[PDB]
């Protein structure tokens, strides 16, 4: 029993284990549940990795009990807070599913079960006039890990500072190490041009992304499937996605020295399901 291939040559497997073997576009409308969105200046939309969200199949299900699928009660658009873009802004970040932990019945289902999974639709809104200039880069990062603020210890960020919620965090232009040994702050110090994790910002376009250019469009839409090394996981311990918004070109208006415009985010869970019902979790978030 020998295998003949071309380079011809012959190979034989000696062991029983394979390990041993030698090797139009501007217009958009979205409807989820009882919520709708319209857009008249869009740059199309992005589906991350070309994969649409879907439910978990029988041939890939780890847990054995019957899952819960709220559907319209939780698969709907939630609007977070609105941030202000000025000439001194460096960028903002959010974690998913951390930013929806207090959003109607989605948060209740999240905190009542032990396992959960879901995809997302993210819609970023920012409008200005024909006399404004600027550009924003919106990136979706799987496993968005940020660096700490300590040069004497590593991986010492507290659970509270890493989960800000719907308010999110911001990037900074400089790295400031914390020197309080008695009362360490235990928080991230993400630098903008390093993307907060030691890699150059210019390469962040490897991740799913879009660009809002004030002279072209005023909104961005990203469709994120569920990504993880497991079929289903704990939503309260682990964040699946991170959203990062950074000014690629600074904001400017006519000759004013202090222009400002708002930026709003709307996120919708998709195909979300849960397992392992028990008493509700009461985390220490302060």
């Amino acid at each position: 029993g020998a295998q003949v291939s071309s380079q011809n040559y012959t190979t034989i497997n000696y062991y029983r284990d394979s390990a041993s073997n030698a090797a139009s576009d501007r217009v958009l409308q979205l409807t989820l549940g009882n919520s709708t969105i319209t857009a008249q200046e869009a740059a199309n939309s992005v589906v991350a990795y070309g994969r649409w969200p879907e439910y978990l199949r029988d041939s890939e299900a780890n847990p054995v009990d019957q899952p819960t699928e709220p559907e319209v009660a939780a698969c709907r658009f939630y609007t977070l807070d609105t941030v202000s873009w000025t000439k001194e802004s460096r960028g903002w970040w959010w974690k998913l599913p951390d930013a929806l932990r207090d959003m109607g019945l989605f948060g209740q289902n999240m905190y009542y079960h032990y396992l959960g999974r879901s995809g997302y639709t993210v819609h970023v809104q920012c409008n200005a006039s024909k006399f404004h200039q600027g550009a924003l880069g919106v990136f979706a990062v799987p496993e968005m890990c940020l660096a700490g603020d300590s040069n004497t210890t590593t991986m010492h960020t507290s659970y509270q500072n890493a989960n800000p919620g719907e308010k999110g965090g911001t990037f900074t232009g400089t790295f400031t190490p914390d020197n309080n040994q008695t009362s360490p702050a235990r928080r991230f110090c993400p630098v903008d041009y390093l993307l907060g994790n030691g890699t150059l910002l210019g390469n962040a376009f490897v991740f799913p992304h879009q660009i809002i250019n004030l002279r072209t469009n005023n909104c961005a839409t990203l469709v994120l499937p569920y990504v993880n090394s497991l079929s289903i996981d704990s939503m309260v311990k682990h964040n699946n996605w991170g959203i990062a918004i950074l000014p690629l070109a600074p904001l400017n208006f006519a000759s004013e020295s202090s222009p400002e415009i708002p930026i709003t985010l709307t996120i919708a869970p998709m195909c979300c399901e849960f397992n392992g019902l028990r008493n509700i979790t009461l985390p220490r978030l302060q």
């Binding site: 009882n34 969105i37 319209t38 008249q40 939630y78 609007t79």
Partner: peptide, 21 residues
Amino acid sequence: KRKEAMLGTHVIWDIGLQSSC
């Protein structure tokens, strides 16, 4: 507040060439 109104039925109106919603 928009926080409460965002939980019921709602539409987001973007003002452009179509001036009506």
